[model samples]
Target: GELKVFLCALSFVYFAKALAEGYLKSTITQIERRFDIPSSLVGVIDGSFEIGNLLVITFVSYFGAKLHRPKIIGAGCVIMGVGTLLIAMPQFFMEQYKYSSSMWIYVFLGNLLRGIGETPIQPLGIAYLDDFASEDNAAFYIGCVQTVAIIGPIFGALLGSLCAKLYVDIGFVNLDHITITPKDPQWVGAWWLGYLIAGIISLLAAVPFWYLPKSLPKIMEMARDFLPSLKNLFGNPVYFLYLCTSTVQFNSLFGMVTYKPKYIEQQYGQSSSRANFVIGLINIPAVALGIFSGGIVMKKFRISVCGAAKLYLGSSVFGYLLFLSLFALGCENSDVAGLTVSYQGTKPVSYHERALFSDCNSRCKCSETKWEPMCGENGITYVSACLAGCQTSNRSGKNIIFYNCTCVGISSGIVGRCQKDNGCPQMFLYFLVISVITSYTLSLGGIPGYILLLRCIKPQLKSFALGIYTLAIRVLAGIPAPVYFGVLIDTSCLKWGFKRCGSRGSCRLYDSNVFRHIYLGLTVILGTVSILLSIAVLFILKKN
Candidate 1:
């Protein structure tokens, strides 16, 4: 009964933690736009979770067993709860919907605290369970617990998408006066709602662990028994090559996954909520199923280490080929007048005075820095009605019409960007199909990949190899990939949002083609490198 209670408690905590993390990934763009931070800064915030982990991982993994693990885990759950709540704080009590130095600080620190809290959950929780449970029962308990953790993200993603459809201040603000649609560049959703809810779940996770009494299942270990040797693991060429391959390989994933929603939203002109919903509904389950399928194949085939290398290599090459095909599935740029298209509603030949001052709007004298946009009757978006040369404006509850616009061919325009009836919907479908397939394909090799890492190392060095492998991926791939991806994606930004104080905020629009290129292009390049490394791993594996 005691063990059953512990299992339920740990499983629930895992679910809570994973839900918080998954929901964060889904709403990353909302956080960026709401706070008016650049992608690069947001990337830093995303990476802060790994930074928090690095701070306490080794200490908790080795020395934590000496302490009361259930209490420590409970305390960690409480810390995670505090972190999640603080992450929501920026959304709830802000003076309004914008700022600089402080809000992101809270998010960054909050994410880091969540990371610190997360360190104990897996290593300590699993180790404690394994110590207590019968040998045959250990794997089963952990599997059920892990499956629950895996599925937690699905709900978080769906619910986060649900939140994305609502206005940021859903309850307090009057919907009648609000003009921007959820699809609008200016729109910010209720990203805070899920965080608030998820935090409460984390807080509750602590309660069950606290009430469960500690049995003799807890084991205090001698330091000498757990001594680690990095030399043996690194010196093994297969392990070294596999580590290098995974680190480089995972760089693509971390960067891509973090920005995938933004890419879909910005490129295809889909709403943020819709994009998140589709990604949650489609791609995540594909990945989980793919991983499970790989495990089954490995078992059914009774795969050797050599066979795993071959399986992993084949899947990598196949997946990379599919990844390469995504380059062609791009959409055309948004029809912002004078930027992507000329004021004449035709494609511009060259950039003209920062792409805001054209012959049509030369007399209007619009502010280049300001980014309030309007769509003309000609189906083109102007940076503002001023830039469109509007002389008068009529306002209704949620719609504004600008009259006597000199630049617009029809002499009229309206608020919000122009959503042209192009092939983007079909393209997004193709894109979605490809994205799901690619995730499945890449994950199909996951068990084999794990085998390559596992079998290459000796039994005595299992913990060391596993620890180093995780650390390498986190420190190398997880921490910095998003930042650089942010930087590159920042390059493709066509228009940036500004704070009330007139400094740059988040990007309002992007060069869709360039965005597609850099995002997909960088991923392809990394995938190529990872493939090359996999070959070296295969050759070494063959020779051995």
Candidate 2:
């Protein structure tokens, strides 16, 4: 089919993007420590790369249908490859020139290239898949392909982590591991995975676009003539609605994935490796279950012609509900503090009073001051002098403030140090609950949204629509995402002063009501848009 090269091109573009994201996400914590930056800043900066790349997608998507698919795909491969290479080599340069590490610019450029490359692929790819399949089975085949695409994250995440580890062993990756005090073992190895994957995909993306089947009907040619096709597609209000729906669906998905890990870390006090593993764990089931669930839903609704609209609407609603509940849970947990330390009951014999006690006697008494029995205080304490009377004590009023907030060794272990209520476990549990919700909803919403897109459009326009769809999302979802978040973080900074983690300077941000406002606005927009689309769908297909 004429679409073969196009579909492969699209998959390759997304594959590279997914790989970089997976690698960055998995190793983000180490990245934060190594750079001596806040995890929040790392997330925001890395997320901006995605936004920029998406903007490129938006640029290409507007004209994807008119461009010769093969040329765009080939160009994407070449340009994207250069970007990936830039990303890979810069770490070494940064290592050599300690003061001149502008590696992020290379990473941003790579993302930009990929963004430009992705626009044409998606719309064209879906169109291509339809061209290859019989009309009677087109939707089914497309659905299957969409389902298979879920494997991207699954293989991407695992492979990313693996590649990262392997590169560290080979000494090709130049970044140091900064998580554990001695340096995390998993951190050193995989610095090259993102570039490696990007390089390979960029090279291969060009092949199919250049060599894949070229024979095509005049209509496929005509579809490439931008204005007429654009006019035709836009004339149908239903198509415009679909584009809107797709954008909302994808943004919700991205936001969930982008923030979920941070939610986990903030709530559970988990290490980066542990959080990465947890995020990865959800991949297989989400893909498998989501696909199976979509099939079952489609079959149940007989979503062949008009029912597809219902399914899309219902899916968006389901996503909204899921996101709301989980996000609320995150908010609730944020209001509280996380548990970091436990206090063992004091020695019954009163080790502090009996400084001479070396060991516990039969009478539960310690012999001498040489023992220096560890204090069993519930709150963190800093001792300026060995004598309790001489030491200065300042403790956090919150139960779970980091050790640095207090006078003792480092952190304040007790939650509600001023009060008896230590609410750490409750907050931690809240995070756990939200994590599960995010993974589930992402699978539910993301897979089905693509499947719905495949079902809604005609074969010839599918690839172009896919491009437009991705483009719209880039504008709506990716490009604006960072800006939106930056505004959110900076909103009323004077009123909501940010918290510092510790003296060693490691901590997480807990966005207050600001996220709630964002989420509420997002929910209302998505809900209103979906309803409008549903009404339009009923009207457009009515004449059919």
Candidate 3:
């Protein structure tokens, strides 16, 4: 009964954390538009959580063993709730967001607080579970916790998708006055609502944890000398090799997670809501099942350290092969005027504001910088109806129909934003198939790798080992991977959006081919290196 209660509490905490994490990922496009920031700055915001973790991870993991683990976890949950509230505060307090302004500091600070709060939960909670659960089923229990954790993302994606369909100022502002639909390039969704919902749940999760006991007789003492343990960890070749491989894997994982929904929207022309919904509904479940099955395989086969390594290696190699196929599954870039092509229907040599207001429509005096995209009957995207040289428009709700356009050849003029013929829906189907396989293959190694970590370290150093491992991964991989990936992705932008004050803002469009290469190329490189290290780890295990 006591064990059941503990597992329940821990799973709830896991669920809460995962919910917050997934919500952030799903809302990336919304947040980007809302704040008018580039991917690199958003990456910095994402990485800020790690900054908070680094501040206290070593101390909490080491000294927390000597303290009341459950209560510490409870306090951490409370702080996380506070951080969630902080993240949502900007929605209420600020005037309408100004893209030119640097108000994203609020997001970064809130994420930082979330990182600090989350640090204690994983190291402490997992250690607690491992101490209490029977050794025979330890992997199973951890797998169960992780399975529940993955479910949080599913719900979060759903929440994000639903929220995105609503207006950004849904209840407060009248919808009749709005000029743009969710499909418009200028749309910003209701992103803050998810944070508010997740925050209250996190606060509630803290209450039960506080009433739980401090220590058990079976719990072991953690090492006090951080320097010696640090030295010893580096001295072990097997552990060091494992660390290298894990870091590379995390780099691949973090980069992909941070940018996946954005990729879907850009590549397939799907709305953000649909992209998030598909990820939650399909991709995450495949991962969850794969993780659970990995643990079951180990438990069933009685797999040892070398056996676990072989399992991890095989899964990684297979997964990498499938992931390579993603490059072939891309849709062509959208045909936006003055960005993808000049107003004359020729692809531009290069993009500039001057190209937007060409001789074809210069008589209309269009503001080339404005991004109120409208779709022409000829299946080309104009910057705005004004740019299209439309003299009249009819509005039925927020949807506008413009006629008498000088740019479009057809007599019907342009409608909404120019949309190309659905670009290869078959490509998205293939992408989804590959995504599921890739996710399954990568997750198959999760439990085995976790088990291998436990086996490699001395029993006495177990709690500290988990802490140090998390610290190293965060400092070396998690923090910089997203930032650098964002920087690289940003470089491929074909056209950048601008603030009302005429300052540069987030990217409005990217060269799809260039983006595919850089994003997937970085992932492949990291995955290849990780596979090599996995082989090294296996060889060492055999030698021992």
Best by lDDT: 3
- Pick the winner on TM-score between candidates 2 and 3: 3
Predict model 2's lDDT versus the native: 0.50
- Candidate 2 lowest-lDDT run of ten: 335-344
Where does model 3 exceed 4 Å of error? Answer: 20-49, 78-114, 156-200, 207-224, 342-344, 347-354, 394-399, 416-419
Better of 1 and 3 by TM-score: 3
Rank by TM-score (best first): 3, 1, 2
Q: Residue-wise lDDT of candidate 1 within 314-389, one digit each (tens)?
A: 8888888998998888888877776787766677435443567867777886777787778877788888888888
- Measured by TM-score, the strongest candidate is 3
lDDT of 1: 0.78
| lDDT tens per residue, model 3, 1-544 | 6667778998999899888888887788555554556546766877688779888887788778657889999999999988987888878876763222556677887899898999888777877877777665778878888888888876776677788887778777777988787666677888898888888889999988877876555223344466777778678888889988999999998898678777887777777678877776787898899999898888877888899999999999999889999988887777777778767677644644537776657678765566776777777787777777777888777577887787776234445444446666778888988988899989999888888887787665667677878887888887788879989999998767888667777677788878888888999889999999999999999999
After superposition, the stretches of candidate 2 with alpha carbons farther than 4 Å from their true spots are: 1-17, 24-29, 37-75, 91-109, 144-150, 154-190, 205-209, 216-225, 264-277, 283-288, 291-302, 322-461, 482-536, 539-544
Predicted structure 1: clash tally: 0
lDDT of 2 by residue, 1-544 (tens): 4454455455565566556555555555444433455556565556655665566664465455445656666676677666666666556655431112455666666656654554555555556556655544445444455555555566556665566445343454244742322244323445665666667766765776666654356555553576766776676566776677666655555554555554455444455666666665653456446655665565455555556555555655665565556444432222211111211223222212422211211232322221121221343221111211212234456322233322233223332212223564575566555546545544544434555566555545566566667667766876565456445534412112232343222123333344445644554465556556655665676655
| TM-score, every prediction | 0.77, 0.65, 0.81
TM-score, cand. 3 vs. native: 0.81
Q: On a 0 to 100 scale, what is the lDDT of residue 133 in model 3?
A: 70
**Candidate 2 accuracy as TM-score:** 0.65
RMSD of each: 5.8, 10.2, 5.2
